[PDB]
GROMACS .gro file of C-alpha atoms in nm:
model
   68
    1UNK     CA    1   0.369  -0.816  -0.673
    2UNK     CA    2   0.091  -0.558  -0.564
    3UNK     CA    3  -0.111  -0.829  -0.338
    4UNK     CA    4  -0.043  -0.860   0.037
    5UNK     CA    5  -0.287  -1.190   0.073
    6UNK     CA    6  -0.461  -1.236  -0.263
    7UNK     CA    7  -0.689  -0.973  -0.299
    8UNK     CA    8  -0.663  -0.628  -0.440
    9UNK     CA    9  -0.851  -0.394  -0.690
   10UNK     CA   10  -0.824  -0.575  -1.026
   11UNK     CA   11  -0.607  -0.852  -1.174
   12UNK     CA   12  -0.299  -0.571  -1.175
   13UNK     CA   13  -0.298  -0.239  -1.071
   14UNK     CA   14  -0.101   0.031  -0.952
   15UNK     CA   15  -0.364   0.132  -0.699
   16UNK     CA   16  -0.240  -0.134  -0.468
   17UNK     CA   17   0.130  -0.009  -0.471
   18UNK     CA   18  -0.004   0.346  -0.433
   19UNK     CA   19  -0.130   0.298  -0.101
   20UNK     CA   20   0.280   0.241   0.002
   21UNK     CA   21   0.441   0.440  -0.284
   22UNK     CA   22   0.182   0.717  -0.213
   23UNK     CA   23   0.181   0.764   0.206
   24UNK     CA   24   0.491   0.561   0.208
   25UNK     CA   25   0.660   0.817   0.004
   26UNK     CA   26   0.450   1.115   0.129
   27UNK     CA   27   0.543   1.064   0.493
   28UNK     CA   28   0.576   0.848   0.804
   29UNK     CA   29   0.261   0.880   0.957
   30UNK     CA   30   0.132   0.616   0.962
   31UNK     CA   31  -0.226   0.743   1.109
   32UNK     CA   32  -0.599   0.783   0.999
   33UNK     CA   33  -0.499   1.082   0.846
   34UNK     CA   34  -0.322   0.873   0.590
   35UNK     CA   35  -0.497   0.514   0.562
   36UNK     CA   36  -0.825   0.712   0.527
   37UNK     CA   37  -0.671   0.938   0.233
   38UNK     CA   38  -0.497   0.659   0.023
   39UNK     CA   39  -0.823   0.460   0.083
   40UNK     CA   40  -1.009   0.723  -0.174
   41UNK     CA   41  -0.688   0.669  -0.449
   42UNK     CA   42  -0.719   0.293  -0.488
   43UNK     CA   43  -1.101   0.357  -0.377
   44UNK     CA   44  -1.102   0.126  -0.049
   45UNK     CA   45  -1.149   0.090   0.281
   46UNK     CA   46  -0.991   0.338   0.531
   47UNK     CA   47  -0.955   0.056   0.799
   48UNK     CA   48  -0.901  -0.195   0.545
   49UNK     CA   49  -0.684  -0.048   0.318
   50UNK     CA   50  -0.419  -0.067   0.616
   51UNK     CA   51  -0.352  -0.436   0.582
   52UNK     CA   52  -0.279  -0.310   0.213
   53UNK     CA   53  -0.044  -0.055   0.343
   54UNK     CA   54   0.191  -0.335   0.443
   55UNK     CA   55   0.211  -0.454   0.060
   56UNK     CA   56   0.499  -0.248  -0.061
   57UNK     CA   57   0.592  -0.076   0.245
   58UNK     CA   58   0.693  -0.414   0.372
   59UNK     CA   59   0.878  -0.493   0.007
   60UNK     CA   60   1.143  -0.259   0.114
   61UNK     CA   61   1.283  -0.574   0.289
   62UNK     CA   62   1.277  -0.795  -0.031
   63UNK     CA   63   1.423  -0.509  -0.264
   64UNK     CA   64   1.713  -0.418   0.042
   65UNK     CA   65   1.878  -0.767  -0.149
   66UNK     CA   66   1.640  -0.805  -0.445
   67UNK     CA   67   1.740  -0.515  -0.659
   68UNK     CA   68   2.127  -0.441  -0.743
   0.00000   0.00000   0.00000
């Protein structure tokens, strides 16, 4: 689900898989540039929300055998 450790922005948001699904999707740079821009769309740290930025972008392991 949309939690890398435990917390996140509410009980269940899409904010926390935007930070991935956003930049993720947007491009590969992963830079300041782009931690510091989703942090303003789920409304969290620029620094921080880069341990966020693992949450889905890191999923794409699970789904590679998850999904169909």
């Amino acid at each position: 689900g949309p939690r890398k450790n435990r917390r996140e922005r509410t009980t269940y948001s899409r904010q926390q898989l935007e930070i991935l699904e956003t930049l993720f999707n947007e491009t590969q740079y992963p830079d300041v540039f782009a931690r510091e821009r989703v942090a303003d769309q789920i409304r969290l740290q620029e620094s921080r929300i880069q341990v966020w930025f693992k949450n889905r972008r890191a999923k794409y392991r699970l789904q590679e055998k998850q999904k169909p």
